[PDB]
Write a protein that binds this ligand. Sequence first.
Ligand SMILES: *[C@@H]1O[C@H](CO)[C@@H](O)[C@H](O)[C@H]1NC(C)=O
Ligand SMILES: O=C1CC[C@@H]2Cc3ccccc3N12
Length: 358
Amino acid sequence: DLRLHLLLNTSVTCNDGSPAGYYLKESRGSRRWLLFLEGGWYCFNRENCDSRYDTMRRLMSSRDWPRTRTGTGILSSQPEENPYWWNANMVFIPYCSSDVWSGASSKSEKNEYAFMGALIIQEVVRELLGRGLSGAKVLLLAGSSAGGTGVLLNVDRVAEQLEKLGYPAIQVRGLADSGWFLDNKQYRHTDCVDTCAPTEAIRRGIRYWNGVVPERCRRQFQEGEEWNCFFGYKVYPTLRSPVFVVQWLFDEAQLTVDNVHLTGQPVQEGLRLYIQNLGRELRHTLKDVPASFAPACLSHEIIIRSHWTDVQVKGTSLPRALHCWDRSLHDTPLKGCPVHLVDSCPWPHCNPSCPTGT
Ligand SMILES: *[C@@H]1O[C@H](CO)[C@@H](O)[C@H](O)[C@H]1NC(C)=O
Ligand SMILES: O=C1CC[C@@H]2Cc3ccccc3N12
């Protein structure tokens, strides 16, 4: 159980102006800190944000947040469920800014909603320093789905923040789960009334949120093209902090934005080739990502699932791969302790350890 703390700086808010916050479970005499970013899509204009406020309000507001949450998967404190970091200080940061953790805009006369995801992360880090983060040796910024993309957008800013605050000894690293998306062609193509492909949706989102992206990526793509930095394979090479990338080869959210709706009906040749080419393109974008875990499964998110230990690539689980990553970052590859684990087989569930969906 992680306990809720609403941000003392009440200028840093969820979409509706309620204070943002974080759930914390301390582990004294651990110098490891895990800050996890929740996911859950985004909204990018007044109408679809209003709709999200009606039926996904916990993703836009802290008014109804429970005072505790149970840590699961990598946020679990039992070794049985979390072989990797069970003894770490655990932080769960609710996603209530609907901006892929990129926003830096307050609710005001001109803005019905606040989009402060980038400032929320910075304020959580700042307020944690007085609760023991000042003594940290590693801060792993992790996240799933939109939170995984949020890791990529924010990990170097957390590193810069701690350096400017006087804590250059804290090693900041990133763990991006299910946030590595492709701006590929859709299987069936809509224009953009709502139908809005992620590239166009993000482009409008950045203007609506006052979204911010990592500085080196911003300098490459420049004014008007920042939406590019929301795509993992474009932003990752600009990053300096070590980042472990977890991505299903056949991610369900990727297939959704590709207008692929798998029906149980038989898969025709056109769709078969589309799905196989998606897996191949994902694999290709991970070729030069040394720390990665990419199983050939049709699924979405891994790291806060209670059975996240079950999936294996080439016989190595994700908790083991992350442990090997830890060893590789000690101050040359490790015998039998791999960190680059990308499936090569070409169809969902060709890996027998894939989640069953049960
Ligand atoms: C609260 O957060 C805002 C946004 O980051 C910042 O400008 C302001 O200085 C903060 N206030 C305090 C008292 O730290
Ligand atoms: O989070 C999510 C849900 C799936 C979409 C695709 C995408 C591209 C860039 C950033 C975020 C997201 N998506």
